[PDB]
């Protein structure tokens, strides 16, 4: 009954299908190289991951 | 060009949709009917009919069976406005959600093959001045 309606809409292949590792956000996601991190969360973790600014 | 004339002819013409007249159209099964309409409709029925379109048809069939003095078959209300009109449901009256209200439409024969929500505008038209 209710369990078949609660959270029943598909949440795949969408923008709401994925979220940031850090902030669990839906907007501004980075999927390159399987990062799955928000663009704001990436900047504050880029040095830890191993991404540096050279040029 | 030689010449041309347009003397249009009839024979007690019944309304016809793509070579099939109303008499045979209505009692054709919807499986056979989709084979003679547009590409979008043909794709939709091949993709698999979920329970929602089929459930509305069953209720629409019953609503016609409720009345047998041959007047309007009482309104069935629905949100599913992605329904494709089929000859089976000609003459039925449905209430189609436009987001706020139940717009009431009567299924005319020329409506067949169209989306159910295409006859219920979801926005009141703009009127400047």
């Amino acid at each position: 009954a209710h369990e078949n309606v609660w959270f029943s809409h598909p949440r795949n292949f969408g923008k709401g299908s994925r979220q940031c590792r850090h902030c669990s956000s839906h907007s501004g996601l980075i999927r390159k190289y399987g990062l799955d991190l928000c663009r704001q969360c990436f900047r504050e973790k880029a040095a830890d991951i191993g991404f540096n600014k050279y040029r | 060009m030689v010449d041309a004339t347009a003397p249009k002819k009839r024979t007690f013409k019944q309304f016809s949709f793509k070579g099939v007249d109303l008499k045979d159209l209505v009692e054709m099964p919807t499986e056979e009917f989709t084979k003679l309409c547009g590409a979008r409709v043909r794709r939709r029925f091949s993709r698999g009919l979920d329970s929602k379109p089929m459930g509305l048809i069953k209720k629409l069939r019953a609503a016609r069976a409720a009345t047998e003095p041959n007047e309007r078959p009482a309104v069935v209300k629905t949100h599913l406005r992605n329904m494709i009109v089929v000859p089976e449901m000609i003459g039925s009256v449905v209430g189609v959600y436009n987001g706020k209200v139940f717009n009431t439409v009567e299924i005319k024969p020329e409506m067949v093959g169209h989306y159910l929500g295409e006859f219920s505008i979801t926005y009141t038209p703009v009127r400047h001045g």
């Binding site: 190289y33 704001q40 990436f42 900047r43 991951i49 191993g50 991404f51 540096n52 600014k53 040029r55 | -």
Partner: protein, 102 residues
């Protein structure tokens, strides 16, 4: 299962440890009379990610350009499988990972 043509694949982000492990294995493959092919410098891959600087959407449209260089080297050895694996433990380095394929 004796002497084989054996491939060791070396990948890392930093080249100093990569060349030390690469040279150390070559050194150990020199005093041991083992014929070797390498090291082979694979074209380095530059993993680049370009985001907007602004956490919000105000200001001049300024962009960061982050980088992650990946260097890959493969070395071919002609030695029995027991000899090559113990060489790997001799030249074990935290940064560089090693995969061995026959």
């Amino acid at each position: 299962q004796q002497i084989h043509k054996i491939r060791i694949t070396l990948t890392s982000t930093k080249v100093k440890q990569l060349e030390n492990v690469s040279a150390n294995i070559i050194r150990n493959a020199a005093q041991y009379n083992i014929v070797k092919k390498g090291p082979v410098r694979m074209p380095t891959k530059v993993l680049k990610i370009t985001t907007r600087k602004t956490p919000n959407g105000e200001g001049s449209k300024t962009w960061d350009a982050y980088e992650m260089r990946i260097h890959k080297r493969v070395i071919d050895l002609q030695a029995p499988a027991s000899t090559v694996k113990r060489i790997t433990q001799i030249t074990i380095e935290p940064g560089v990972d090693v995969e061995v394929t026959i």
